[PDB]
Ligand binder design. Structure first.
Ligand SMILES: [Zn+2]
Ligand SMILES: [Zn+2]
Lengths: 1038, 112, 32, 112, 56
């Protein structure tokens, strides 16, 4: 006799047509005048200065017309007058429609509102386009006269929508703002209206009841009680009589006052608005987005108590402080009272896999320094909601910096497997554990719906040990933030049957409570995950926009040398001044370039063009600074001999780590013999290697003497190029897919020349496709166990992917790749579906593949992506066995950048025959060290001598203050236990050594091991004890 | 008491909507209680009962129905047995009801 | 890491074999 | 690394997923080896077959360092098919080899 | 271990200690050892009685 579906349809119609219009009924219409800026935006300071002195025309504008260019700005002057004595007990808001596309947000036009003074009120957004004007008492935001006239200003940004409802469509609107109406938007509405809260309360009540009905288990009493209440309330509501809206509200009161179930989860909600530093828009638009988001958050705090908001990146704080001092002051006032929570303590939200360990440490250091010196807040957790995987060295770095918990939600995007836990201990490759939580709502920007709460509650993977989870609600990836409607729904969700129990809470408190509950319930059975956090998605991010990875690695490798040279020069000349501020600026630029959408290479052409210019400029400047420091050192060291060309490579084998050594040094080995065989083949042979190069420019036989090993399986070619068809269905730049593999096409070349420059055999190969030319140089040096490859490529392809094959002839089950501060192991044999998901992993400067008694290594210059597969032999054909290892070189995506990586590229790699961990470390360090000129071969400042084990002295620098102390960062590399001795230069005689944390703060956790027993000692002769991947940090005081 | 508690927990687990917190809380309580019960030590039967106490003290949902229970024993006057056996059946049933009243308060019984 | 069905099977076995016998343990036998 | 029939087999000590935890009691044939990059130790057994391995997580605030807990299964007392199983006298032999390689473990296992 | 400096027994652990588990499986008594049998360990304690040197 009662049909619930009919009630739901009737409720939807009534809410859309008869209730929502009565919220914000217009009472006046505003006059609009326009002023266009087709080029780059004018700062608000300059605009208001010009406006108050004149210089602005404000041509008349009529509602319903189109205003914007492709990336230009439009300033609107809005004039109005209130009716006679109108504000009779209503807040009297202000509605501004800019022609919003309904089914989207934060991907297109927006704007801020200003008072003639020059201070912002609140931004306007697709679902947030109300601006507070007055109150019931009559207190206004802007000067209103006896006539009642008032004026406001509105800065409107016209940004194109690069993600339509058909996603991933190629466009040319992503660079060099043009000044043409590529897609104009209509204004069509600007009104002054009153705000009736009764109708919004009724709308929210109806929405909550109807949405609860969609998950309420038909054939349960709750479902039918809700249906009856909805029907009675809809019957009681008459649109002719305004007051009846209250009587209807008295019918839904019964079902909305029912308490939550005793077994429901406890949800902690914190306001959030993720902002990407540069993704589908330039950074200059990101600054405006940050300002608008903070304006919205401050307005929401003014309009509602019990609301809190968390903001993360320090660079965005710095931009806001520099650009909008008044917004910064208001935000600081809110921070001081504990309603605006800064989180993270990093410069930006960097990628988890690609940046080096020093990059992560510097991000933490600079972010923490900014937070301490500008906001007076010390975060206790790492806040990285969106990142394409995490390295596995993160837990130790976070634990040794002072953090206590970790936050992430990206792992929910996995292709194949479901991660076993949401609340757990993440343990690194060393043993340090941190408390990690994955928000089960599967998003960092929730809309506060019953659907999201139900999905989160039944998605939680720890229902047997915990009942606590964290909710991040707001609009994200382009700014926006929480709205008034979200909070008005969350107020209902506090104690409601069929829903979890929601409460606004600071994330620190949530993490404390959740960890306490987990530790109390679990005991010994507490969830632990050891290793890295591999993301089964976006595997093409290791190869896209190769210039980004190239510049990142090169700038780090040059910064290490520059900092070491500065430290050495300061200790040698009291009259030398260390360029601290310029190096800080360069470091901050690099850290900004290391963001989760810039370093992977998944942004528009504008962003990557700017990043390339930054890389070029900073690399040139760093080279010049290094030359200056070398000149100072030579002037202060007349006794040493100059080196025409030399490199300083950390961990050089044979007890000569931080010494500067020539590119070409005299050797006992004779010149490398060359020979041409019967059919164009070339036979290179030094004392230790025998290389055979076929007429196609491919290595067919790499024979190792004094071991008898053939490093190339029969029937395979080493150094052969493969072209794959990469046309993914989704996320073109982000993705390489399974089907792209198995559509490989080998590319064939030929030999052109053989040379012997300095006793080294050199072979030149040309490979062609048609507008795509690769020139390869194969080099063998006297006495070297390594074979070198250099490549110059002219990439002119489209939707193709380039790899090079390196068959090795070693049967191994797993492969050892280089991690940030150690080693990681990944399967070569893929038995299960989870294994096959890791078919394209990351390698950091080298990889090792070895059986019980023999290993070979592959060294790379600036390559990051690679894959490994088994080669199964057949004694009836001659193919023996082995491992197919392939390096990813280039890709040609189309969506965000329509012409990606079209041009000239350089690549370097090498194969080391009889390789151990140490030998691979030597090869990787030497190939990545920069080359300087006229370098004195002074003795190293500090040295680590390993009695047993492999310990790498990774970094030397000066302390981040005026003390002049020497900071040393070292770690255990092999993976076992190591014992080491510390030695110092003659200048550091009588100097003291003591252990600190990664931020030099001298305060360190008791749980973590120290590796410097007996504490403060003398620097010369100090004894060190490293566990597996220990990462010790020492401070040496003169 | 332990047998009834275990039976109630296990039977509740069979209708408790897998993928809900109640199901997994009940499973954890059952596992812990079964671990805590040692047949060699008689007194441990109480300690195990202290593990199922948490999940059995949770209140009912606010929208649950209100059920009124009355003791009943239908007796057919003559069906598959003569009436002279029905008289004996009636006597036996009333004996059982009176004994149950002696053994337990808060119990009621209806006869027709 | 926790299998509810195994717990249910284990509970059934324990109730049938190790708990129910301890209810009403015989102490004497009657002549009939 | 455990000894196979005609070679070696490798089984996880760290059990991250549910599939790993299912292999919590495996077989060892005359020896097992546990080693880091530069040091290994072996456990030799005479006639034992079942064993398990788990991680030991340290705490520098107490003094417990780290390591691997390796345990050998010696005896059980089942009841169903044989009501009195393995009731009586048994002999067991095992050994720990400190600086062990594959060859040294083979020597120790063969001699014992 | 001399000539390497390694301590083969972690601090806080005892090597050679016997453990007794409660093995009462629900199914296949002889066949099965179950997860719950672990975590119900009881260490068994002994004492030293004699020290000897037979052949060095
Ligand atoms: Zn993002
Ligand atoms: Zn009947």
């Amino acid at each position: 006799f009662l049909k619930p579906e009919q009630q739901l349809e009737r409720c939807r119609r009534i809410v859309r047509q008869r209730v929502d219009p009565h919220i914000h009924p217009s009472i006046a219409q505003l006059t609009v005048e326009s002023y266009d800026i087709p080029g780059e935006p004018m700062p608000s300071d300059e605009f208001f200065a010009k406006l108050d002195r004149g210089d602005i025309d404000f041509k008349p504008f009529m509602l319903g017309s189109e205003w914007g260019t492709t990336w230009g700005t439009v300033w609107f002057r809005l004039t109005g007058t209130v009716p006679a004595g109108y504000p009779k007990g209503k807040p009297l808001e202000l509605i501004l429609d800019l022609g919003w596309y309904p089914h989207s947000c934060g991907g297109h036009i927006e704007g801020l509102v200003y008072r003639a003074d020059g201070t912002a009120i609140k931004a306007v957004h697709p679902l947030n386009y109300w601006v507070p004007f007055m109150d019931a008492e009559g207190n206004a935001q802007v000067p209103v006269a006896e006539d009642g006239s008032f004026t406001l200003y509105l800065e409107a940004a016209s940004n194109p929508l690069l993600l339509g409802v058909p996603p991933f469509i190629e466009t040319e609107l992503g660079d060099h703002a043009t000044g043409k109406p590529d897609e104009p938007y209509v204004f069509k509405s600007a009104d002054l209206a009153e705000f009736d809260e009764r109708y919004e309360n009724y709308s929210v009540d109806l929405d909550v009841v109807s949405s609860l009905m969609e998950f309420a288990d038909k054939q349960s009493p709750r479902y039918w009680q809700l249906a009856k209440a909805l029907q009675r309330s809809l019957n009681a509501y008459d649109e002719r009589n305004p007051e009846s809206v209250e009587a209807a509200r008295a019918v839904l009161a019964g079902v909305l006052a029912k308490p939550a179930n005793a077994s429901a989860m406890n949800v902690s909600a914190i306001g959030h608005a993720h902002i990407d530093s540069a993704w589908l828009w330039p950074v200059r638009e990101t600054r405006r987005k940050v300002a608008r988001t903070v304006s919205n958050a401050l307005a929401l705090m003014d309009a509602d108590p019990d609301f809190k908001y968390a903001m993360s990146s320090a660079q965005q704080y710095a931009w806001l402080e520099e650009d909008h001092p008044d917004i910064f002051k208001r935000m600081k006032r809110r921070i001081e009272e504990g309603r605006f929570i800064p989180v993270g303590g990093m410069w930006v939200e960097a990628d988890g896999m690609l940046p080096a360990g020093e990059s992560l440490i510097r991000q933490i250091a600079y972010g923490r320094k900014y937070f301490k010196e500008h906001l007076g807040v010390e975060p206790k957790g790492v806040w990285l909601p969106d990142s394409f995987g995490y390295t596995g060295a993160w837990p130790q770095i976070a634990r040794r910096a002072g953090y206590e918990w970790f936050l992430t939600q990206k792992i929910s995007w996995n292709d194949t497997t479901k991660f076993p836990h949401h609340s757990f201990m993440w343990e690194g490759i060393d043993g340090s554990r941190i408390f990690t939580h994955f928000p089960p709502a599967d998003t960092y920007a929730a809309w506060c719906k019953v659907q999201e709460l139900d999905y989160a509650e039944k998605n939680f993977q720890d229902k047997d040990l915990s009942d606590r989870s964290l909710l991040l609600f707001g609009f994200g990836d382009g700014g926006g933030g929480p709205t008034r409607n979200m909070m008005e729904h969350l107020h209902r969700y506090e104690n409601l049957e069929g829903v979890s129990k929601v409460s606004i809470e600071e994330p620190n408190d949530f993490f404390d409570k959740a960890h306490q509950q987990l530790a109390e319930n679990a005991g010994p059975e507490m969830p632990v995950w050891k290793g890295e956090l591999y993301l089964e998605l976006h595997r093409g991010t290791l190869t896209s926009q190769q210039d980004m990875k190239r510049g990142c690695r090169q700038e780090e490798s040059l910064l290490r040398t520059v900092e070491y040279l500065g430290a050495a020069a300061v200790l040698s000349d009291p009259e030398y001044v260390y360029p601290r501020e310029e190096l800080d600026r360069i470091w901050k630029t690099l850290l900004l370039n290391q963001f989760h959408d810039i370093l992977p290479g998944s942004a528009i052409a504008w962003v990557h063009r700017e990043a390339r210019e930054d890389y070029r400029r900073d690399l040139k400047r760093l080279a010049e600074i290094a030359q200056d420091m070398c000149a100072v050192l030579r002037k202060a060291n007349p006794q040493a001999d100059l080196l025409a060309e030399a490199r300083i490579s950390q961990f050089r084998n044979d007890g000569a780590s931080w010494h500067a050594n020539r590119i070409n040094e005299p050797t006992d080995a004779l010149s490398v013999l060359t020979q041409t065989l019967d059919n164009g083949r070339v036979l290179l042979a030094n004392g230790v290697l025998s290389v055979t190069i076929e007429a196609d420019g491919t290595i067919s036989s790499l024979l190792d003497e004094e071991h008898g090993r053939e490093l190339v399986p029969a029937g395979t070619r080493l150094g052969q190029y493969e072209l794959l068809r990469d046309e993914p269905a989704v996320w073109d730049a982000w993705e390489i897919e399974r089907e792209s593999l198995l559509m490989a096409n080998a590319v064939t070349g030929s030999i052109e020349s053989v040379n012997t420059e300095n006793g080294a055999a050199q072979v030149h190969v040309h490979t062609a496709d048609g507008d795509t030319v690769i020139t390869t140089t194969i080099t063998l040096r006297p006495g070297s166990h390594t074979l070198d490859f250099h490549a110059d490529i002219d990439w002119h392809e489209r939707e193709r992917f380039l790899k090079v094959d390196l068959p090795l002839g070693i049967v191994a089950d797993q492969a050892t790749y280089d991690c940030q501060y150690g080693l990681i192991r990944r399967p070569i044999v893929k038995n299960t579906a989870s294994d096959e998901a890791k078919y394209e992993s990351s390698t950091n400067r080298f990889a090792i593949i070895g059986d019980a008694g023999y290993a070979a290594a592959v060294i790379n210059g600036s390559v990051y992506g690679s894959d490994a597969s088994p080669i199964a032999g057949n004694a009836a054909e001659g193919r023996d066995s082995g491992t197919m290892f392939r390096l990813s070189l280039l890709s040609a995506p189309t969506f965000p950048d329509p012409r990606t990586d079209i041009g000239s590229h350089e690549f370097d790699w090498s194969v080391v025959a009889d390789a151990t961990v140490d030998r691979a470390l030597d090869a990787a360090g030497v190939l990545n060290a920069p080359v300087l000129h006229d370098v004195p071969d002074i003795t190293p400042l500090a040295s680590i001598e390993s009695v047993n084990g492999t310990v790498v002295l990774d970094w030397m620098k000066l302390a981040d203050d005026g003390s002049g102390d020497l900071i040393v960062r070292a770690y255990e590399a092999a993976g076992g236990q190591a014992d080491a001795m510390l030695h110092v230069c003659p200048a550091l005689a009588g100097a003291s050594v003591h252990e600190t944390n990664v931020l030099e703060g001298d305060d360190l956790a008791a749980d973590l091991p120290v590796a410097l027993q007996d504490g403060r000692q003398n620097a010369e002769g100090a004894t060190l004890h490293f566990g597996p991947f220990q990462l010790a940090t020492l401070r040496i005081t003169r």
